[PDB]
Design an enzyme around this catalytic site. Sequence first.
Site, PDB file in Angstrom:
ATOM      1  CG  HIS A  12      -9.063   5.627  -1.402  1.00  0.00           C
ATOM      2  ND1 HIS A  12      -9.204   4.702  -1.987  1.00  0.00           N
ATOM      3  CD2 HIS A  12      -7.838   5.875  -1.722  1.00  0.00           C
ATOM      4  CE1 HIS A  12      -8.381   4.070  -2.655  1.00  0.00           C
ATOM      5  NE2 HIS A  12      -7.441   4.944  -2.638  1.00  0.00           N
ATOM      6  N   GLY A  41      -0.595   3.584  -6.143  1.00  0.00           N
ATOM      7  CA  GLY A  41      -1.115   4.582  -7.176  1.00  0.00           C
ATOM      8  C   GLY A  41      -1.943   4.012  -8.305  1.00  0.00           C
ATOM      9  CB  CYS A  98      -6.504   3.365  -6.283  1.00  0.00           C
ATOM     10  SG  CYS A  98      -6.147   2.187  -4.717  1.00  0.00           S
TER      11      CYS A  98
HETATM   12  C1  Y4J Z   1      -4.498   3.023  -4.459  1.00  0.00           C
HETATM   13  O1  Y4J Z   1      -4.832   3.995  -3.793  1.00  0.00           O
HETATM   14  C2  Y4J Z   1      -3.804   2.038  -3.443  1.00  0.00           C
HETATM   15  C3  Y4J Z   1      -3.496   0.863  -3.849  1.00  0.00           C
HETATM   16  C4  Y4J Z   1      -2.805  -0.186  -2.853  1.00  0.00           C
HETATM   17  C5  Y4J Z   1      -1.417   0.436  -2.484  1.00  0.00           C
HETATM   18  C6  Y4J Z   1      -0.469  -0.941  -2.440  1.00  0.00           C
HETATM   19  N1  Y4J Z   1      -1.090  -2.004  -3.138  1.00  0.00           N
HETATM   20  C7  Y4J Z   1      -2.340  -1.817  -3.770  1.00  0.00           C
HETATM   21  O2  Y4J Z   1      -3.376  -2.307  -4.335  1.00  0.00           O
HETATM   22  N2  Y4J Z   1      -4.842   1.775  -2.232  1.00  0.00           N
HETATM   23  C8  Y4J Z   1      -4.683   1.997  -0.860  1.00  0.00           C
HETATM   24  O3  Y4J Z   1      -3.421   2.469  -0.437  1.00  0.00           O
HETATM   25  C9  Y4J Z   1      -5.416   1.837   0.228  1.00  0.00           C
HETATM   26  C10 Y4J Z   1      -6.317   3.242   0.679  1.00  0.00           C
HETATM   27  C11 Y4J Z   1      -7.387   2.907   1.606  1.00  0.00           C
HETATM   28  C12 Y4J Z   1      -8.022   4.163   2.224  1.00  0.00           C
HETATM   29  C13 Y4J Z   1      -8.535   1.870   1.598  1.00  0.00           C
HETATM   30  N3  Y4J Z   1      -4.868   1.213   1.502  1.00  0.00           N
HETATM   31  C14 Y4J Z   1      -4.185  -0.015   1.265  1.00  0.00           C
HETATM   32  O4  Y4J Z   1      -4.397  -0.610   0.098  1.00  0.00           O
HETATM   33  O5  Y4J Z   1      -3.300  -0.249   2.174  1.00  0.00           O
HETATM   34  C15 Y4J Z   1      -2.506  -1.450   1.892  1.00  0.00           C
HETATM   35  C16 Y4J Z   1      -0.833  -1.004   1.921  1.00  0.00           C
HETATM   36  C17 Y4J Z   1      -0.261  -0.427   3.175  1.00  0.00           C
HETATM   37  C18 Y4J Z   1       0.235  -1.210   4.192  1.00  0.00           C
HETATM   38  C19 Y4J Z   1      -0.709  -2.148   4.707  1.00  0.00           C
HETATM   39  C20 Y4J Z   1      -1.048  -3.427   4.420  1.00  0.00           C
HETATM   40  C21 Y4J Z   1      -0.567  -3.983   3.122  1.00  0.00           C
HETATM   41  C22 Y4J Z   1       0.702  -3.182   2.288  1.00  0.00           C
HETATM   42  C23 Y4J Z   1       1.329  -2.260   3.585  1.00  0.00           C
HETATM   43  C24 Y4J Z   1       0.030  -2.010   1.458  1.00  0.00           C
END
Ligand code: Y4J
EC number: 3.4.19.12
Lengths: 299, 299
Positions: free
Chosen positions: B40, B142, B144
Amino acid sequence: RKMAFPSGKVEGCMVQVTCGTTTLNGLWLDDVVYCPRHVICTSEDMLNPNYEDLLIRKSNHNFLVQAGNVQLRVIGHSMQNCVLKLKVDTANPKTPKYKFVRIQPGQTFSVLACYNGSPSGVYQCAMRPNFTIKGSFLNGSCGSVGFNIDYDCVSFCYMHHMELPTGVHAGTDLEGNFYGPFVDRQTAQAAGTDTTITVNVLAWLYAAVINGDRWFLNRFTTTLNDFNLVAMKYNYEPLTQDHVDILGPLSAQTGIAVLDMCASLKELLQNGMNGRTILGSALLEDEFTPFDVVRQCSG
Amino acid sequence: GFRKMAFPSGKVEGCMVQVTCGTTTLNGLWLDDVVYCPRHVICTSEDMLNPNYEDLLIRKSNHNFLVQAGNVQLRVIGHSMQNCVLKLKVDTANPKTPKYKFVRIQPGQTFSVLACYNGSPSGVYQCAMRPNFTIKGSFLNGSCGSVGFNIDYDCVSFCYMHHMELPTGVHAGTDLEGNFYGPFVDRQTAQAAGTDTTITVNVLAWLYAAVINGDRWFLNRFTTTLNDFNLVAMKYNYEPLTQDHVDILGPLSAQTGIAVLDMCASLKELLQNGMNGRTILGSALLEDEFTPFDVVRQC
Ligand SMILES: *[C@@H](O)[C@H](C[C@@H]1CCNC1=O)NC(=O)[C@H](CC(C)C)NC(=O)OC[C@H]1C[C@H]2C=CC[C@H](C2)C1
Ligand SMILES: *[C@@H](O)[C@H](C[C@@H]1CCNC1=O)NC(=O)[C@H](CC(C)C)NC(=O)OC[C@H]1C[C@H]2C=CC[C@H](C2)C1
């Protein structure tokens, strides 16, 4: 969650030090290896050592320093309090930027537990008010170190020397001065009665507020002196001026004055939790510092 | 002493890099001349809402990927996708590549996480793969591409790469072949996990740890059959205990003199009566993220 610092910069400094058949770990920074001075003791010597006398009998060529199986030749030695310093003929190319610091009770640090110069695990410890830590240390672990990492710089604060009858651990700073009233003699020693680390409990309450868990915020304030006198009746540590100052950032972030939080904690002590929880727990946590709360709620 | 302990992280720290595509930055794992990261990274904030990854990826060129190791840019000279992980071939071999394997862990197994931001290690902690295939991590924006791993001898077994957080605050990700643990998808949409359960064999290991450390308040004179224990365990949303689990607990049982099914009767009592305010190894709750191996290794 307890989170340790990445251990790589310290792993690259761990060596083993052997005198006779007594082996422990040492810390190799530039061309000096630091280790507990009881490496010069046989098991029987440890019952009642005269370290000055034992060391006069030693020469450079009696010390085996090894990085793995690779020997580092010792070219000088001296004793500083309860640590031995061995000058070696090789400067460690993995030496990080570093400092030696002496920490206060309540401060946390990561421990790299080592055996035979080989790292085995890393975990977070808090220095208790009675100057012990709840480590996980077995035979051969002495010379393992505790540290914090800030930007480029490893601040070494703890070197491991011993276990107490109650299962907790004691050691020195990297100048060889024990934390607490302990000595490096194989004798019956007792940790005094421990207390709860107030500044860390306050940090935990601030963490709860940051995450929207704030039912315990009351409408009162207190003075620092009044709070200190009440808290000691509950086996809590008194706050210092430095404690008030290190809570500053969390106070600013939440808009809750330190002394208002103290008044909220006072009510929790005097009236109890009344069945409720804080951050999903009926126990107040006292092993996260204000820095740890910031570390984890940030990156 | 007994502590939640992570593996030393140095061998993994030397593999972490930063990967940037567009305004999206996360971490990669650099082994030999390949960087592994979550796919992603190729998405805009708009793409993440519903990505057709093969379609997005075919439209990218090597130069769309900025890989940075420290202050050094590594040139990408090829790229492919394996399930939910992107593989970037670079023109430089990582000189710090450890001996390594890619493994897919079983629910209830533990691993260490090196949390990283912008390719820089920030902290290390121990996690378990939950029965519902989430992990209770500490991951921020950040994070990931941070990885989970175990170390045996010189060999790092990578088992987890971080991809997302669920609405409940727990975390989900993949193995290093890019297959998720659990019924999750790398799309920015709210996702629930299956009902979680408690890892029974781990609770029993931790109760034995508590005895090895001199605490036996929770023991009792009763016993139980395996099946009658499992009936009660399932009622309390605990996983069933298998005969393999019983066998795996043998070393701890022998050490302490407490038959596995006697400890099962102890746990049955704790489940039916609670802890009545007491604590075990400092916890007000039954801890289920130590395996038998973890306890044994550290004891
Ligand atoms: C790494 O890119 C990132 C890590 C997460 C961010 C917050 N905590 C994590 O572990 N991954 C993402 O942002 C991921 C990307 C998708 C394309 C799979 N999406 C995600 O983790 O959504 C969660 C976020 C956004 C809101 C929705 C629900 C929970 C909370 C608020 C955190
Ligand atoms: C490192 O040399 C070693 C580490 C300890 C051994 C077990 N766990 C430890 O943390 N330190 C010692 O062995 C130390 C040397 C003295 C010169 C200070 N002595 C010591 O720790 O004694 C503890 C032993 C002996 C009994 C007393 C209390 C605890 C337990 C039973 C272990």
